[PDB]
Amino acid sequence: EKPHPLKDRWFVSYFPVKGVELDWVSTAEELHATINAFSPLTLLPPDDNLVFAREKVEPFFENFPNGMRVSVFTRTKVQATQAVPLVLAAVMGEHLRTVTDGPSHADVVRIAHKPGTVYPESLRVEVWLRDRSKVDAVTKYFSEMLAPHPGIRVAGRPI
Amino acid sequence: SSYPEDCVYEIAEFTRLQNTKCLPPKGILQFATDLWKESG
């Protein structure tokens, strides 16, 4: 019944195709309620990004000079229902720390509905890492966590 | 059910909270309401 606190507080913004500052989330219940309010994420306006930033870091590439971007691409609503909670648990839930030997530096999470011609419910979930040295462990982690679902794709690209 | 002292949650325990009845913070709640009103 008691809330499940998050290790860090995360600031929620919405960037339509600068951003709209919304509010802080500091518990797992507030974080899930935020996702439920923007659900189905697959019906969001195309290209808009819903953003969670650790301690309100400004979510721009200039603040991640030697960082990495880990992206999870889904094609269907069932796949989004599997991948999104998993990313939130790894990042806000801090489960990525089981492979990063301390802080993960996964400081920004971005979610966008990116419709394709064949797959209209396609989503793109990005995880921005401030520290490049951990991208190998982070990518392996996401790949293994999402291996049961071969439809979900994981990729790393620099910032 | 589990409340680890370091706030590093097990995946299953974190994901089971997706069915929460808790409301989101007011700034998020109002914005999301207005966003779905502008779609239909």
Numbering used by the authors:
A (entry chain A): 7 to 23, 37 to 178
B (entry chain B): 79 to 118
Q: What's the paper's own text on this?
A:
In eukaryotes, mRNA recognition is mainly mediated by the cap binding protein eIF4E, which is responsible for binding to the capped 5′ end of the mRNA. eIF4E is part of the eIF4F initiation factor, a complex formed through the interaction between eIF4E and the large eIF4G subunit. The remaining four eIF4Es all bind to different eIF4G homologues (five are conserved in trypanosomatids), forming a minimum of five different eIF4F complexes. The EIF4E6/EIF4G5 complex has been linked with the stage-specific translation of mRNAs encoding the major Trypanosoma brucei virulence factors. As first described by Marcotrigiano and collaborators, a curved-shaped α/β structure forms the cap binding pocket on the concave surface of the protein, while eIF4G and 4E-interacting proteins bind to the convex side of eIF4E.
The structure of T. brucei EIF4E6 in complex with the TbEIF4G5_79-116 peptide (hereafter called TbEIF4E6-4G5) was determined by molecular replacement using the EIF4E6 model predicted by AlphaFold34 as the search model. The exception is the region comprising residues 24–36, which could not be modelled. In contrast, even though the TbEIF4E6-4G5 complex was incubated with the cap-4 analogue prior to crystallization, no electron density corresponding to cap-4 was observed during refinement of the structure, indicating that it did not bind to TbEIF4E6 under the conditions tested. The TbEIF4E6-4G5 complex shows an extensive interaction surface. The TbEIF4G5 canonical helix interacts mainly with TbEIF4E6 residues from helices α1 and α2 through both polar and hydrophobic contacts. The loop connecting the two TbEIF4G5_79-116 peptide helices, together with the lateral helix, also accounts for a large number of contacts with TbEIF4E6 residues from helix α1 and strands β1 and β2, including a hydrogen bond between tryptophan 114 located at the C-terminal region of the TbEIF4G5 lateral helix and the carbonyl group of alanine 56 from TbEIF4E6 α1.
